[PDB]
Design an enzyme around this catalytic site. Structure first.
Site, PDB file in Angstrom:
ATOM      1  N   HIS A  62      36.404  38.672  43.795  1.00  0.00           N
ATOM      2  CA  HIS A  62      37.720  39.207  44.118  1.00  0.00           C
ATOM      3  C   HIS A  62      37.606  40.702  44.384  1.00  0.00           C
ATOM      4  O   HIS A  62      36.865  41.396  43.690  1.00  0.00           O
ATOM      5  CB  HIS A  62      38.664  38.949  42.931  1.00  0.00           C
ATOM      6  CG  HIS A  62      39.855  39.857  42.872  1.00  0.00           C
ATOM      7  ND1 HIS A  62      40.954  39.705  43.689  1.00  0.00           N
ATOM      8  CD2 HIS A  62      40.133  40.907  42.062  1.00  0.00           C
ATOM      9  CE1 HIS A  62      41.861  40.616  43.381  1.00  0.00           C
ATOM     10  NE2 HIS A  62      41.388  41.359  42.396  1.00  0.00           N
ATOM     11  N   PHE A  63      38.319  41.187  45.400  1.00  0.00           N
ATOM     12  CA  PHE A  63      38.328  42.614  45.720  1.00  0.00           C
ATOM     13  C   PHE A  63      39.650  43.111  45.143  1.00  0.00           C
ATOM     14  O   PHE A  63      40.721  42.715  45.604  1.00  0.00           O
ATOM     15  CB  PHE A  63      38.301  42.841  47.234  1.00  0.00           C
ATOM     16  CG  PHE A  63      38.020  44.270  47.620  1.00  0.00           C
ATOM     17  CD1 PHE A  63      36.729  44.674  47.958  1.00  0.00           C
ATOM     18  CD2 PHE A  63      39.036  45.219  47.599  1.00  0.00           C
ATOM     19  CE1 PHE A  63      36.459  46.010  48.270  1.00  0.00           C
ATOM     20  CE2 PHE A  63      38.779  46.556  47.910  1.00  0.00           C
ATOM     21  CZ  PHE A  63      37.489  46.952  48.245  1.00  0.00           C
ATOM     22  N   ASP A  64      39.573  43.979  44.142  1.00  0.00           N
ATOM     23  CA  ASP A  64      40.769  44.464  43.456  1.00  0.00           C
ATOM     24  C   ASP A  64      41.400  45.727  44.018  1.00  0.00           C
ATOM     25  O   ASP A  64      42.628  45.831  44.084  1.00  0.00           O
ATOM     26  CB  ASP A  64      40.438  44.670  41.975  1.00  0.00           C
ATOM     27  CG  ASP A  64      41.652  44.543  41.081  1.00  0.00           C
ATOM     28  OD1 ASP A  64      42.415  43.563  41.244  1.00  0.00           O
ATOM     29  OD2 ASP A  64      41.837  45.410  40.203  1.00  0.00           O
ATOM     30  N   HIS A  98      35.370  39.662  52.399  1.00  0.00           N
ATOM     31  CA  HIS A  98      35.135  41.107  52.202  1.00  0.00           C
ATOM     32  C   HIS A  98      33.804  41.708  52.621  1.00  0.00           C
ATOM     33  O   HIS A  98      33.601  42.906  52.481  1.00  0.00           O
ATOM     34  CB  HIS A  98      35.367  41.439  50.729  1.00  0.00           C
ATOM     35  CG  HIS A  98      36.732  40.961  50.250  1.00  0.00           C
ATOM     36  ND1 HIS A  98      37.901  41.496  50.747  1.00  0.00           N
ATOM     37  CD2 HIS A  98      37.102  40.020  49.350  1.00  0.00           C
ATOM     38  CE1 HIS A  98      38.933  40.902  50.174  1.00  0.00           C
ATOM     39  NE2 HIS A  98      38.476  40.001  49.324  1.00  0.00           N
TER      40      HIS A  98
END
Ligand SMILES: O=c1ccn([C@@H]2O[C@H](CO)[C@@H](OP(=O)(O)O)[C@H]2F)c(=O)[nH]1
EC number: 4.6.1.18
Length: 124
Positions: free
Chosen positions: A119-121, A12
């Site tokens: 984590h990219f939510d 990311h």
């Protein structure tokens, strides 16, 4: 092995470019970052901000994660991002994506010590 924090950066982070992109940005980035090795990762977002600015989101607005966990955070300021979505005609191993640019608040999950993104939510 690879730590979750390192994986977040690989998947990311792309500070090297402000708006970045080119119609082929995602097609090249999803491949170079090895996100099309085991399969065509369906959706993946790249953030065009400094690592420090993204890491800092972990101390910003606490919001519920899509999975129900409580360790998600939303950036107070909007950030330059690029969403990569696999096309409908994309066929592994020739993964094809649509490169979309936007300026939105990112939501990431953070864990560990140091407390960093893993984590990219979502983006809103
Ligand atoms: O706005 C969004 C929503 C989802 N994802 C992609 O969805 C995964 C499955 O939750 C993620 O991987 P991750 O947990 O390895 O970050 C994220 F990378 C994005 O990149 N952007």
């Amino acid at each position: 092995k690879e730590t979750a924090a390192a994986k977040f950066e690989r998947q990311h982070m792309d500070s090297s470019t402000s708006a970045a992109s080119s119609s082929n940005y995602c097609n090249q980035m999803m491949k170079s970052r090895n996100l099309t090795k085991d399969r065509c990762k369906p959706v993946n977002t790249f953030v065009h901000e400094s690592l420090a600015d993204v890491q800092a989101v972990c101390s910003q607005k606490n919001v519920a994660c899509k999975n129900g966990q409580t360790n998600c955070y939303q950036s107070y300021s909007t950030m330059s991002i690029t969403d990569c979505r696999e096309t409908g005609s994309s066929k592994y191993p020739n993964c094809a994506y649509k490169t979309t640019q936007a300026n939105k608040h990112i939501i990431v999950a953070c864990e560990g010590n140091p407390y960093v993104p893993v984590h990219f939510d979502a983006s809103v």
